[PDB]
Amino acid sequence: MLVKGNEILLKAHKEGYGVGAFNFVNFEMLNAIFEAGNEENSPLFIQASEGAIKYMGIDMAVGMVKIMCERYPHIPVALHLDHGTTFESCEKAVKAGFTSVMIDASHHAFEENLELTSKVVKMAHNAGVSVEAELGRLMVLVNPKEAEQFVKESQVDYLAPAIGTSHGAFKFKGEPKLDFERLQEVKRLTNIPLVLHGASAIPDNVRKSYLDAGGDLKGSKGVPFEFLQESVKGGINKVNTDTDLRIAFIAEVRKVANEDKSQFDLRKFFSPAQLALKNVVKERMKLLGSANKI
Amino acid sequence: MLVKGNEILLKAHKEGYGVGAFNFVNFEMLNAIFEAGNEENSPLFIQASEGAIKYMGIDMAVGMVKIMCERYPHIPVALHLDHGTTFESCEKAVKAGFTSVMIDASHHAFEENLELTSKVVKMAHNAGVSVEAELGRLMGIAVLVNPKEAEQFVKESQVDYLAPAIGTSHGAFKFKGEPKLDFERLQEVKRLTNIPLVLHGASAIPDNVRKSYLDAGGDLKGSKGVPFEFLQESVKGGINKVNTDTDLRIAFIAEVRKVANEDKSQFDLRKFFSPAQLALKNVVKERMKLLGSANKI
Numbered sequence A: 001m002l003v004k005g006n007e008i009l010l011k012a013h014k015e016g017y018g019v020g021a022f023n024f025v026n027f028e029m030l031n032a033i034f035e036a037g038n039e040e041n042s043p044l045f046i047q048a049s050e051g052a053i054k055y056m057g058i059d060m061a062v063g064m065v066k067i068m069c070e071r072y073p074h075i076p077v078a079l080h081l082d083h084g085t086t087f088e089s090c091e092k093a094v095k096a097g098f099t100s101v102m103i104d105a106s107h108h109a110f111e112e113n114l115e116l117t118s119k120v121v122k123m124a125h126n127a128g129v130s131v132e133a134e135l136g137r138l139m140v141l142v143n144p145k146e147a148e149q150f151v152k153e154s155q156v157d158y159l160a161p162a163i164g165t166s167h168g169a170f171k172f173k174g175e176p177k178l179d180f181e182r183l184q185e186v187k188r189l190t191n192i193p194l195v196l197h198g199a200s201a202i203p204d205n206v207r208k209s210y211l212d213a214g215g216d217l218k219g220s221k222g223v224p225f226e227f228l229q230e231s232v233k234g235g236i237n238k239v240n241t242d243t244d245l246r247i248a249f250i251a252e253v254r255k256v257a258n259e260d261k262s263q264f265d266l267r268k269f270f271s272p273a274q275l276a277l278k279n280v281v282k283e284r285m286k287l288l289g290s291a292n293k294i
Numbered sequence B: 001m002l003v004k005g006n007e008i009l010l011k012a013h014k015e016g017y018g019v020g021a022f023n024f025v026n027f028e029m030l031n032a033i034f035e036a037g038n039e040e041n042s043p044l045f046i047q048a049s050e051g052a053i054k055y056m057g058i059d060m061a062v063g064m065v066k067i068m069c070e071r072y073p074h075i076p077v078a079l080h081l082d083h084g085t086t087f088e089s090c091e092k093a094v095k096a097g098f099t100s101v102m103i104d105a106s107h108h109a110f111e112e113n114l115e116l117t118s119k120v121v122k123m124a125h126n127a128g129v130s131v132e133a134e135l136g137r138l139m140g141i142a143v144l145v146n147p148k149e150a151e152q153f154v155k156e157s158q159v160d161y162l163a164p165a166i167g168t169s170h171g172a173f174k175f176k177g178e179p180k181l182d183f184e185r186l187q188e189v190k191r192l193t194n195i196p197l198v199l200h201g202a203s204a205i206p207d208n209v210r211k212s213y214l215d216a217g218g219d220l221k222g223s224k225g226v227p228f229e230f231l232q233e234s235v236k237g238g239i240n241k242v243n244t245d246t247d248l249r250i251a252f253i254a255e256v257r258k259v260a261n262e263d264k265s266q267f268d269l270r271k272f273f274s275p276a277q278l279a280l281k282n283v284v285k286e287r288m289k290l291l292g293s294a295n296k297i
């Protein structure tokens, strides 16, 4: 049952735990996420990038989530627009039924980012939808004092502080390093739920399965489980996870393709994929402490 | 927009053309099928096996179709339960929103098959839902349909359409040698029943699809489907609904295997399924024009 993204993140902010924000592009991904939340009794933060919406059609994105909500009525679910690049996009998501929208204007200067974000807040809050913004650059780092004013004047529901992460299986070209001292300053000055982008970990088991199936993850490096927990302690309440889901999913697809070359039954390809993806999500929920929160 | 399967097939039956019945198991397959019907201006017959419903959940199966119907309000769409094995199964489909159901009891004796079909018919017809039944066993080369038996069966059950066994079968391996269908037996059934007929296991395994699968490192172990000529012979023989599934799977997975081989560092699902959809869409588009359902909307 769709609920405001803030309704989920304010609880996580109070009690000091993190809720996983998992991306999806189709049915297989969506199904495995809900089943994971059901078996872990965990809140669900379902994300959809603009590239994913384009792929599915915003009508199918919301439509499929609504259907899933009906079969799992006891689970709190927030539908979040991931990385909206324009006011129009966020507005379309709001009209479509999204309960949470992100307006990514980190590339802009402070004033521009603030004005565009404020405009989005006015619109979304009017329709009862939560809003997410971003300061810093996913590649530089966030200015705690900027975050303080930014949050105060925009009245945004949650903020994504750049502390050293980035999307993809290749986050660190060296030793994984995040600015936790900066994260804590931001948390103290804003006192709102914080979001961590590019937070995939690339677990040993997930990497292993992918490489066994003839996949190439040479040099890949995500955020260690240690750091993910330090982030939550630091004030991170929303943890974006996508790469991990993809890798674990394709790992089984590649495997099936190798084992049996006469196999063309989609269900035989995506059944193991869903399972492998569900397990990654289940483990992540327990890691962040969102398990048994319902 | 959902329409009773009979609405689509009755037009095909009286105009003498065939409508493709395409199976789906998820969003990708469904989307490619709709875009095919849209680009070919063809009526859509969408069906799901009990295995597909198990995989998706009958709520999602129906839910996804209704969403697609909304983004394509000008295309007649029939939601069909493929190979329902029980009354309860057919009853669930009816309640879920299906517009057409098949009750497959062809493995039973005439009397049992008739008894079950009739019970399903009375229920489905009460909810404004069409029904399909089957006489004869879907096997390759009595197993073929008895024309007289079909006459009484249809006349007594009042079933909407009938799937007569004339030689086809499911899978990529239908013919071990020369393809052969009993078109004489088909025409007698059509004459005696005078209703829309359905052809099961009617995948052709086109050469471009076969080649594509083999290229991506796939293995078609002496697979052979129904030649394009046979399918056209079937339609001229009285066939109005043509079950297609294998062709879709193969064309789809072919593109999946390809991407896996081409780029081993690729793990973006959209990069795998975008080409897979396209390949599937083109298969459906060609089949629509072959069967002659193109431009009927």
Ligand SMILES: O=C(COP(=O)(O)O)N(O)CCCOP(=O)(O)O
Pocket: A023, A049, A050, A051, A052, A082, A083, A166, A167, A168, A169, A196, A197, A198, A199, A200, A201, A240, A241, A242, A243, A244
């Ligand atoms: O934070 C992340 C990614 O985190 P991860 O790579 O560590 O999983 N995200 O918000 C995912 C953004 C989705 O992008 P796209 O669908 O266009 O490729």
Ligand SMILES: O=C(COP(=O)(O)O)N(O)CCCOP(=O)(O)O
Pocket: B023, B049, B050, B051, B052, B082, B083, B169, B170, B171, B172, B199, B200, B201, B202, B203, B243, B244, B245, B246, B247
């Ligand atoms: O006629 C056919 C298939 O014909 P084809 O194999 O020639 O494409 N069908 O009704 C499809 C039956 C679906 O079976 P499953 O349980 O594997 O989902």
Ligand SMILES: [Zn+2]
Pocket: A083, A167, A197, A198, A240
């Ligand atoms: Zn991100």
Ligand SMILES: [Zn+2]
Pocket: B083, B170, B200, B201, B243
């Ligand atoms: Zn069949």
